[PDB]
Amino acid sequence: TCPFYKKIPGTGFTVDAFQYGVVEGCTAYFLTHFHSDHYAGLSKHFTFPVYCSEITGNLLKNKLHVQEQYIHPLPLDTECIVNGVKVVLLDANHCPGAVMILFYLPNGTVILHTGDFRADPSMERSLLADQKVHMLYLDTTYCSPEYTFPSQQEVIRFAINTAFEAVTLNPHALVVCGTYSIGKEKVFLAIADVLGSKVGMSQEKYKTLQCLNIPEINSLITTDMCSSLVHLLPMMQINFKGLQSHLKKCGGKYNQILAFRPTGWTHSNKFTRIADVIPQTKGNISIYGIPYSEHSSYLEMKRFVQWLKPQKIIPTVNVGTWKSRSTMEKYFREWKLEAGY
């Protein structure tokens, strides 16, 4: 049944709660972003109002065939009224179209649901700075101090320099980038840009990217694989078997693959610097795992919460075990005592 942490008290609202059937007493279903653990259950047969960003509403219509009359897209950074309650959508710094939601309850409580986010200091100068937040529904994916990772910028720098070196040394090398959802587009687009190529992909993935309002997108992507030296493939195919296979398909146009797997965190983060990342190589195939995260590091999350000073925190990730729950609650108390709220 619908967990409490998907329900917004004092409203008839739910957040990312599409897999429970009809939630009893829910008059509006918010969707923070287009990732499957969050949209699970939406289809053309859904007949309740869904509130979301423009981008997320393009994906609902075009990819899941939700009928237009049930999609209620909202502009960002704008006070809007939904079933008599003031709300604001803010950028979540996650994937394209991902939002955080501010709810201004009739009784005077203010609630921020982060959806999935990567906390950033730029958030300290949105509409959040203007008033106090009593309850925080927090993306806790990496709420433990072992989770450090580089900035997105340092990671993209590493990838651009690696790819550019490899292809200038060998103009017959192919670059492959793995994907399984939206998000992380900068990886493959930045690499294609430095190489003077478009990114070649399947028709289903090209359709997905055309929903996202990226500027100049017709200039960076294509479904003609033959004319491209940066190919996007399902993350499942980013392994030695899958890449040998794919290489055979290119018909002797290429004699080497350099592949990128942008993971979340992986334990080499505890030791290794970005400068010091190396591939796994077999034959004429190399695979780089790069730590491109679209969730907060532990330290980014701590800063955000210590700035915001909420009165109550409700975790939305890693809530299924007692040892996780208990550990998270201990960090929340540490942060509150160190900062004095």
Ligand code: NI
């Ligand atoms: Ni997500």
